C-alpha cells in the first residue's frame, strides 16, 4: 500500500544511541542530508531528491520519531524531540555512514533541526538550506493575533498530553490532509503525489507517531525556544553558508522577508522566494531543486 | 434526564428575531440578566442565582446558540455569534419580558456579550458585572507565546470549519471535561456540581452546539476583535457602572492586571479578585454571589 517514491534509492536503518533513523540513500558525491517536517516523512523529498542525487549522496531521513525512524521515549522536557536532541541524533546517524561533514537541507521541523544543528555543531555542515521556516524563537517572538491564528497548531500541539493527542485522534485522516491542503498555494491536495499523501496519512494514523509530533511541538514551545533564546541573547550566528527558501504563500514579507530575519541568525545567508505554499519540494519541485543544486554545488 | 438546578425558577422560552432564548427566571425586584460562557450553559449560575433571586428578578439565559437556546445559522462572518449580535438578540429577549433597562452579569463568553452590549447599547444597562474576562481585544493584543499557550483554544476553535468541529467530534466528552477541569483552581471537576457537569456535557455532545461554540470563537478571533478594536482606538468607554470580578487563578489575570485593563475600557469600574479559577460562580459561589449582590444592590 506504500509506494517506493525513490526508485534506485537504497533504504538504510541507521542505528543511533537513541534509536534507528530511517533513510532512503541515493546518489554519489558529497553527502547531503534532507530532513522533512510536519506532518510529513522523508517521502516529501521524492520530487527533488532524484535531482539532488545527480550530484550528491542524498540521504533522505525520517526525523527521530517520524516516519519509520524509531521513536525515543520522551520525558517531561520532550528532550528527544528538542531540535538540539534531534540534531545530535542525526549527527550520530550521519557518523554511522562516515559523514562527519555534510550538506543539510531541512523543511519545516527538519529545518528547525537543521539550524539548531548549525548553531550547535556548525563544523558538521558544509552548507545549510532551510525551507520555509524562521527560527522557532522568531515565530514565538512574533506571536500576535495574526500568527496565533495562522500557526495555531504551534500552541495547540504544545498543549499538555493528552489533549492534542486525544483531539487528533478525533479525525487523524482529516487533520493530516487538512494540514497538507491548507498550507499549499492550491488549498487542496492536488500539489501532492497521491502516493506521498498516503505515506503521510499512514504515519499520521499511528497514535504513537502523533504523540511524537506533539512532543516535537511541545519541544518547539519550550526547550527549542529557550535554546534559540540563548543563541539570540549570546548573539550566536550560524557561520555555515546557508540558503533560506520560502514559499511566497508560506510566510513571507508582511514587515520583513525571511531573508532579513535569517540575516540576524546567520552570517552568510542567501534567500529566495519560491512560487509555492509551504511544501516547496512538492509544490515547486523544479524551482526548489534548481535552487538547492545551485546552492549546494 | 437533566437536573433542575434552579428550584423555584420558572423557565422561559423567549422569542427573538434570531431564535428563542432559553432562560430560567426567578426572584423579584429589579431585572438581572445572567449570561454564562463556554463550555457551559445557564446552569453554571445555579449556585449564585438563588441568592441573587432574593433581591432581583434573575433571568438566567442560555446564550444564543448555547444550551437550549436556538442556534441561528451562522455565516461567513459568524455574525449571529458575534458578541454584538448576541447582545442585540438578548436585548430583544429582555424587551420581550418588558426589561428595557436591566442589570447584567456575564461570565466568559457571556461577559463578552455583556461588555459589548454595554458599549453598543449602554442605555440598556443599569449596571454591568463581567466575570473573569478582559475585552477580547485585550486578549488578542496580549497574545504572546505564554498567552498563546495558555488560551490556545482561542486560536484553535477559531480555525475554519470543520477543523475544530472534526477534532472535537471524536470524543466531545473529553474536551468539555478537559476545559472545565483545566480552568478551575483545582484542575479537576470537583468544583462543579456533577449535575451541572452533565448539563455541560450534554450540550457539548450535540455537534451543532459544538459548531456554534466554534462560531463563537471564530467571531471572537475576527468580528468581535474588530468591533473591540474600533472602540479602543476611538477611546469609547463603557459608561455603565461596572464590576470586574476575576479569579485569582483565572484566565483574565494571566494576560494582565484586570482592573488596569478595565479602567481603559470603562469609565466607572470596580474590581475584585476572587480566589477561584475561571469558573467563579461554581468555584467560589458564596464570594461571587456576595460580590454581585453588593454591587447590584
Swiss-Prot record, chains A, B:
Q: Where do the AB hydrolase-1 domain residues begin and end? A: 30-268
The residues that the entry says bind fluoroacetate are: 109, 112, 153-154, 217
**Outcome of mutating residue 38 to A:** Reduced catalytic rate. Minor effect on substrate affinity
Q: Which UniProt keywords apply?
A: Hydrolase
Cite the SUPFAM superfamilies for this sequence: alpha/beta-Hydrolases
**Which Pfam families would you find in this protein's record?**
Abhydrolase_1
Signal peptide bounds: none
Q: Where is this site: Important for enzyme activity?
A: 132
Q: What is catalyzed by this enzyme?
A: a haloacetate + H2O = a halide anion + glycolate + H(+); fluoroacetate + H2O = fluoride + glycolate + H(+); chloroacetate + H2O = glycolate + chloride + H(+)
- In this protein, the active site sits at 108, 278
Instruction: Return the EC number.
Output: 3.8.1.3
The answer to keyword Hydrolase applying to this record is: yes
Summary of the function given for this chain in its UniProt record: Catalyzes the hydrolytic defluorination of fluoroacetate to produce glycolate. Has lower activity towards chloroacetate and bromoacetate.
- UniProt family annotation: Belongs to the AB hydrolase superfamily. Epoxide hydrolase family.
Quaternary form? Homodimer.
Q: What is this protein called?
A: Fluoroacetate dehalogenase
Q: Which organism is it from?
A: Rhodopseudomonas palustris (strain ATCC BAA-98 / CGA009)
Give the classification, highest ranks: Bacteria, Pseudomonadati, Pseudomonadota, Alphaproteobacteria, Hyphomicrobiales
